[PDB]
Scaffold this active site. Structure first.
Site, mmCIF file in Angstrom:
data_model
loop_
_atom_site.group_PDB
_atom_site.id
_atom_site.type_symbol
_atom_site.label_atom_id
_atom_site.label_comp_id
_atom_site.label_asym_id
_atom_site.label_seq_id
_atom_site.Cartn_x
_atom_site.Cartn_y
_atom_site.Cartn_z
ATOM 1 N N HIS A 174 0.806 -1.206 0.000
ATOM 2 C CA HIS A 174 0.000 0.000 0.000
ATOM 3 C C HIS A 174 0.855 1.280 0.000
ATOM 4 O O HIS A 174 0.324 2.350 -0.126
ATOM 5 C CB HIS A 174 -1.058 0.022 1.095
ATOM 6 C CG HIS A 174 -0.646 0.174 2.518
ATOM 7 N ND1 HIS A 174 -0.007 1.274 3.080
ATOM 8 C CD2 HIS A 174 -0.914 -0.652 3.538
ATOM 9 C CE1 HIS A 174 0.172 1.074 4.380
ATOM 10 N NE2 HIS A 174 -0.339 -0.112 4.671
ATOM 11 N N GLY B 184 2.151 6.474 9.955
ATOM 12 C CA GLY B 184 3.550 6.311 9.615
ATOM 13 C C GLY B 184 4.185 4.998 10.101
ATOM 14 O O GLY B 184 5.321 4.721 9.706
ATOM 15 N N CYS C 98 3.286 1.791 9.511
ATOM 16 C CA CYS C 98 3.142 0.649 8.622
ATOM 17 C C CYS C 98 4.520 0.183 8.130
ATOM 18 O O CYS C 98 5.443 0.994 8.044
ATOM 19 C CB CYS C 98 2.227 0.888 7.440
ATOM 20 S SG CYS C 98 0.511 1.148 7.908
#
Ligand code: NA
Lengths: 300, 300
Positions: free
Chosen positions: A41, A143, A145
């Site tokens: 993603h 932030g 991930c």
């Protein structure tokens, strides 16, 4: 003496954390040898996350659109590929700090340490468990991930989790390092409801063993039970069924304490029926389920 | 979202841990520049610990009686000196992995991360608080002495704790990095009784602020209180007195949540009076006091 929620030392993983930017999404990646692993993603905008066609979005991206930063120094991305829900960014430099590692897909009820990162930089470490509904109860802000979960076994880092998503209920979902989600979750911003968050019975028993080791004994009763009679109780309290495999895994803690596993099962049944009466166990007012049998032995 | 007991990444401290052996006592030391810091009780036998004359015991020791090992490699001890309850072993090699550091003496109620070590090797990391009675509730087995507590602030490691002792009650005592004990404790195996372990009220309030941030709001009541009226309550529950310095430290969390500190104080008073009624707050069945105001802001 004493008993803490204890994480593995994070230094070996700190040396693997990088920043990945694609377009204007920045998150964290894991640099092992000449590959950087990150959530796919990274390629999505906000609007893309509503309904992403990852294969189509990936058409628009070339190697030079992946900005990889290791501290204050830029890595050259020389190839990229999507493997389930992760990207693998081949880089021209092998990580000099690469530890001995493997990728492992854990079972529900297994625990791990998380190194929560932002912009490629370590923020902090804590323990987690893979819930039976395949969520984790992390601490993750925007932030984070690509932050990873791991165990260290024999000076080899076994990576088991990469962080992808927060559900609307504020629990967390992610993948193994092959990019396969734990549970039914998808990397899409859509309604995803977790199922029943049951209690990890074998872990509770381990922690009761830990408490006896450490001198907290008040809850030991004069009863025994059977695996079937225990399990009729466990099911009404949304506890996971105990199996003879579980009993076998508890044998070392049984041997150490002289408390037969079924006896400890009877003690737990009384704690489920009667509650704790305002008392504590290893300084918890509730029954803790995020220690495995192996976690207890390691700590004790 | 979510809220965890979160330790600092331990890598900077892992690189400082060594093994110190004197005679046949082995424990851990902290190697920063060309000095190794360790508990002076390294020089004591079992029998010595009953009633040690450290100055006299130190007469019998020369530089070559201190065996310092950094991994699988031996450091040359070129001088030694006792500073309160720590030894400083000058070595001929500066630690190449020395981080930016300071030594700080924390106040009661301040938190830190511990890297529990055995034989010079990192075992695990967890959070601690300096209790108001100047004990900590660690997880420390035989061989863990010299393990350190720390905070990381601005990429500078502030060392605040070195582990020396377990009391008969199984709580822990130790020094700052100048070798001064926290509290009245001595490096002697004698009866040492801790005083009253009171609750760190300002920390509880921070954690209630953390809970509101994270969506756990059930406990917010319709009352306010005064600092004096609150404190008459706090004293009967062995809570530490709240000061206007405490209120000032909570201002940022007040500003974020729109909940006036005295309002949150009234909510806590009701939780002390009525208990939690089998409900939880940030997944704890009791009021957690090992998060500082600064710890909450950092995590949120
Ligand atoms: Na609790």
């Amino acid at each position: 003496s004493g008993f803490r929620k204890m994480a593995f030392p994070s230094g070996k993983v700190e040396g693997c954390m990088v920043q990945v930017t694609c377009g204007t999404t920045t998150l964290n990646g894991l640099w092992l040898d000449d590959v950087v692993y990150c959530p796919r993603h990274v390629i999505c905008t906000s609007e893309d996350m509503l309904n992403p066609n990852y294969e189509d979005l990936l058409i628009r991206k070339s190697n030079h659109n992946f900005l990889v930063q290791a501290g204050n120094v830029q890595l050259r991305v020389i190839g990229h590929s999507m493997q389930n829900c992760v990207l693998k960014l081949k880089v021209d430099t092998a990580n000099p700090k690469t530890p001995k590692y493997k990728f492992v897909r854990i079972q529900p009820g297994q625990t791990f340490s998380v190194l929560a990162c932002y912009n490629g930089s370590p923020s902090g470490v804590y323990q987690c468990a893979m819930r039976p509904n395949f969520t984790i109860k992390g601490s993750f802000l925007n932030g984070s991930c690509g932050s990873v979960g791991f165990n260290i076994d024999y000076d080899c880092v076994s990576f088991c989790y990469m962080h992808h998503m927060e559900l609307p209920t504020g629990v967390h979902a992610g993948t193994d390092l092959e990019g396969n989600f734990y549970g039914p979750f998808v990397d899409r911003q859509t309604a995803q409801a977790a199922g029943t968050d049951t209690t990890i019975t074998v872990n509770v028993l381990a922690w009761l063993y830990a408490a006896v080791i450490n001198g907290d004994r008040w809850f030991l009763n004069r009863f025994t039970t059977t695996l079937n009679d225990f399990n009729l109780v466990a099911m009404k309290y949304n506890y996971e069924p105990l199996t003879q495999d579980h009993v076998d895994i508890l044998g070392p803690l049984s041997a150490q304490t002289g408390i037969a596993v079924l006896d400890m099962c009877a003690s737990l049944k009384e704690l489920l029926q009667n509650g704790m009466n305002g008392r504590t166990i290893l300084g918890s007012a509730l029954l803790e389920d995020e220690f495995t049998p192996f976690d207890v032995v390691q700590q004790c």
